[PDB]
Each structure stands twice: as structure tokens, then as C-alpha cells.
Amino acid sequence: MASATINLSAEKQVIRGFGGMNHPVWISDLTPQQRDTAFGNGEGQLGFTILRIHVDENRNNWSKEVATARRAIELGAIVSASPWNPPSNMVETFTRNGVPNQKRLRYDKYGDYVQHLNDFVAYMKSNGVDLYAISVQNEPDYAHEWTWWTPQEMLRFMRDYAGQINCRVMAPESFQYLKNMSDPILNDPQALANLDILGAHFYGTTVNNMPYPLFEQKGAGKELWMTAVYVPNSDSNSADRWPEALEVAHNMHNALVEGNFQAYVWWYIRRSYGPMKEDGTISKRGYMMAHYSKFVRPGYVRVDATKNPTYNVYLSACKNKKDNSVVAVVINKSTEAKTINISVPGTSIRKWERYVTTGSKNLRKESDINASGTTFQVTLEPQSVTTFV
Ligand SMILES: O[C@@H]1[C@@H](O)[C@H](O[C@@H]2CO[C@@H](O[C@@H]3CO[C@H](O)[C@H](O)[C@H]3O)[C@H](O)[C@H]2O)OC[C@H]1O
Ligand SMILES: O[C@@H]1[C@@H](O)[C@H](O[C@@H]2CO[C@@H](O)[C@H](O)[C@H]2O)OC[C@H]1O
Numbered sequence: 001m002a003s004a005t006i007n008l009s010a011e012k013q014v015i016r017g018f019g020g021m022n023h024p025v026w027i028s029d030l031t032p033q034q035r036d037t038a039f040g041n042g043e044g045q046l047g048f049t050i051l052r053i054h055v056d057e058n059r060n061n062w063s064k065e066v067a068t069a070r071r072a073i074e075l076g077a078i079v080s081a082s083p084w085n086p087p088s089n090m091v092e093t094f095t096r097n098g099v100p101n102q103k104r105l106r107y108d109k110y111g112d113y114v115q116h117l118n119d120f121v122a123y124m125k126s127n128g129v130d131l132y133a134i135s136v137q138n139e140p141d142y143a144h145e146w147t148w149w150t151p152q153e154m155l156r157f158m159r160d161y162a163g164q165i166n167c168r169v170m171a172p173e174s175f176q177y178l179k180n181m182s183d184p185i186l187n188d189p190q191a192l193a194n195l196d197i198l199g200a201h202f203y204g205t206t207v208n209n210m211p212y213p214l215f216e217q218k219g220a221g222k223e224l225w226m227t228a229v230y231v232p233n234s235d236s237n238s239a240d241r242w243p244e245a246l247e248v249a250h251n252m253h254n255a256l257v258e259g260n261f262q263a264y265v266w267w268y269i270r271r272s273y274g275p276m277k278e279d280g281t282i283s284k285r286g287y288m289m290a291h292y293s294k295f296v297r298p299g300y301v302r303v304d305a306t307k308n309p310t311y312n313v314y315l316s317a318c319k320n321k322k323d324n325s326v327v328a329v330v331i332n333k334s335t336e337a338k339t340i341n342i343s344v345p346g347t348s349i350r351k352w353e354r355y356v357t358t359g360s361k362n363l364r365k366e367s368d369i370n371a372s373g374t375t376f377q378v379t380l381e382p383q384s385v386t387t388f389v
Contacts, residue, residue: 010304017049020266168196239283
């Protein structure tokens, strides 16, 4: 009989949401039906609340983003946009660690690059897409195939130019949440003032690298978003592999509880290793996401809770401040069942519904949990995720 405690009085980060990437230039756009599967929150829908899109370097491509972005917004999502390269007339080449022909933004074009970003913001606004945020650069520190920014180039842009962007500014979107890319911004008062959202990717980011003390120190009034990952691999036709898919839930748990992230955004929504399969159905990896996205809605607040109450069991909890209700997401990676007494002191809640995913069922509604006082005794099937609501 393991125990856990959920402390509804110890509020952590406010949840902004969950979602993934659309890229209708590199791959096919989501279809009408796939837009609904991704951003609706009905039966057989993922309940995503964040769409990420790219800012094409060629403005003649911008129209390709509109249908999916508009539909996501109609269904209640917010949209964030990231550039990979500036327009070619703003780029120059340089040699980086002996590798020639690498791209950077010309320093003398920083003002023009702001205008490019602002033009994108205005174009999208004119088409019913009020962007929540725009990034300086996708993966400035992993730009073999796009545009590099050193930590200092990123800093100088954030300090000197980002205040001119007509949107919330996201930076720096390091590929692995490398703190050398973001520390300069947090330490410079002008750059920090111009920041709105600290964005990070999770490729190869270990749990020990998910906390960020400097952001805890300096980041008041800034959001913290995990804007791209796939886990645990991008193997072809892997999205239903079990128990590998449990790594998706675990990574989300870790982002939330170890990283204090307010948003978790996958790479391509529709892909053979993604949350939606090429046939338009939800994969096992997608149901992992859905355990969070369908239930932990924007504006819920994470609360302190025993994160790992017994070996191979992981727990997160979020509160709806409208009525102090609780959503708990509990991962059991063990090959045996686990029984846990979850204490929720001070709650007036006395019953939880539960939905369970395993290798053989998806979001199956199982028997209700009736509390004895403020303690909810739950039994977790082997190799499962359960959301309690
Ligand atoms: O020239 C273009 C290529 O650059 C492009 O290759 C893609 C580059 O992006 C990789 O996706 C990355 C996945 O990991 C993180 O989320 C990255 O930031 C993404 O950019 C893709 O796997 C490549 O296919 O292909 C299109 C071509 O026009
Ligand atoms: O798609 C790209 C990934 O392939 C890349 O993967 C990471 C590279 O660094 C390693 O230390 C990590 O283990 C690995 O996941 O991340 C960047 C992304 O653009």
C-alpha cells in the first residue's frame, strides 16, 4: 500500500495546453477531418489546445497555413509560429566549426527580420488567426539545415530588436533545452523584458536537465513552453508500439512536474510515429497525450503532488480553480498492478471517474473511485495510464 498526497494549496504552473505541429509545405496539411480529430475534444478526438506552425521564408507560402490554423482556433486552440530561415535576401553564409556555407541572419538585417515576422503576424490576423506568439528561431543551436544563432546573436536580437515584434515573443527554442541559449536573455533586463515565452525543445533532454533554476529566479511573468519533441524515437510505423508508447506519457509527466512546463507540443501531429497515424486514427502515442490533453484543460493549475509514489508509478495533478476539482494522471510502467492510497487533504470531492489506456484498450472508462474521507484508493493495471477526473 503505497501512498501519495495531492496538495491543492501548493499551486505550481498554470497550464497553457498541449498539441503538435502542422507543416503543409514540408508534408501534407491536415485534412478537414484530421483538424477535427486533433483539436476537437469529443469522442475519438485528441483535445489538443495548441497548434504550432512555421513562418515560411517565402511569403507566397503563408496562405497554406490558414485553413488548419483557423480551424484549430475555431475549436478553441491557440497558435504559435516559429521560423526556420529568414528570407534569403537577409541571410549570409559563414563557416561554423569548420563546416562551410552555414546560414545566419545578417546583423544589418535584424530590423528587416522584425518586419518579416510582423508581416506574418499581420497576414495571419487578416485571415482570422490571431497568433498567441511568434519565435525568433526554431533550434538556433541545431541549424545544420536552417539558420544558426549563437547565444550572443540571440541575446542581441532579444535585447535590441525583439521589442519591435507585434506579438508575444518566444525564444530561444533550443533543440535540447540547452541553458547556454537562454541564460543570456534571463540575465539581461532589456532582453528579458522583450521575452514573453521561454520556449524549449526536448530532443535528448534528460530529467536532470528539465529543472531551470535561473528561470525560477528571473522568469516572473514569463511563460514556459516545451514546443517540440518526439519520443522515444521516430521509427517508421512505431506509433502503436507497446509498452514503448508509455515513454510519451512519462516525458509529459516529466515536462510538467520536473520542468514546470505550461505547454507540451509534439512534432508533426500526423505521422507514422506521431499522435495521429497516417490513416487519421489516434495512435497509442496519441492516447498517451490525450490522457493529459483531453482532461487537463487550459487554465487548470498544476499542484504539488507526490510525483513517484512507488517504483515505476508516476503521478501529476492539476486543479480547476472554478470548482477546485482535480485531474490526476497516473502512469504505471510496472508489469504488475499497483494499489495506491491517494490523499487529497481538504478536498470536498468524493468521487473520481477514471479512464484507462493499456496495450489492449484506449481511454476505457472503468469503475468509479469512491473516496473514504479525503483518501482515494486506486488500483493501476500493469503498463497503463489512468486519468482520474
Ligand atoms: O530542405 C528541407 C529540409 O530541411 C527538410 O528536412 C526536415 C528538417 O526538419 C526535420 O524535422 C526536425 C524534427 O526535429 C525537430 O522538431 C526539428 O526542429 C525539425 O525541423 C525533418 O525530419 C526533416 O524532414 O525536409 C524538407 C526540405 O524542403
Ligand atoms: O530531428 C532532430 C533530432 O534528430 C535531434 O536529435 C537529438 C540530437 O542530439 C542528441 O544528443 C539527442 O540524443 C537527439 O535526440 O534533435 C534535434 C532535431 O532537430
